[PDB]
Write a protein that binds this ligand. Structure first.
Ligand SMILES: [Ca+2]
Length: 132
């Protein structure tokens, strides 16, 4: 039974989530999550997405999706590929033009963006720990 989360993190299913605040570009958020022993959030189901939207900032948040090698394939920071997606209409933009980072809007839907864009929120996740 794995639902144990650290103080300030919120459990959903087998993961823990931290809804961060404070102005950060994508890689800044990446390291903020890393320094908290987590990583920018990966999303693999509509149930997970719905949970995130419920707790997420109205003004948009960095998540852990990025065009890894700059060549057009978006990969989650945890290493996994996209199965579930929640792209906003028309996203991602059908051009390789250096908008390699993904944010989640107030609606929960995703759009690509310049990685140096400063957003006011960012979400981390980590595995919940378990009772023996
Ligand atoms: Ca776009």
């Amino acid at each position: 039974v794995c639902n144990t989360c650290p103080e300030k993190w919120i459990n959903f299913q087998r993961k823990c989530y931290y809804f961060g605040k404070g102005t950060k570009q994508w890689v800044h958020a990446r390291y903020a999550c890393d320094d908290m022993e987590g990583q920018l959030v990966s999303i693999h189901s509509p149930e997970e997405q719905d949970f995130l939207t419920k707790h997420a900032s109205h003004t948009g948040s960095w998540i852990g999706l990025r065009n890894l090698d700059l060549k057009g394939e978006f990969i989650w920071v945890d290493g996994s590929h996209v199965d579930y997606s929640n792209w906003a209409p028309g996203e991602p933009t059908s051009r390789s033009q250096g908008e390699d980072c993904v944010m989640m809007r107030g609606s929960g839907r995703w759009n690509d963006a310049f990685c140096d864009r400063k957003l006011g929120a960012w979400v981390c996740d980590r595995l919940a720990t378990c009772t023996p």
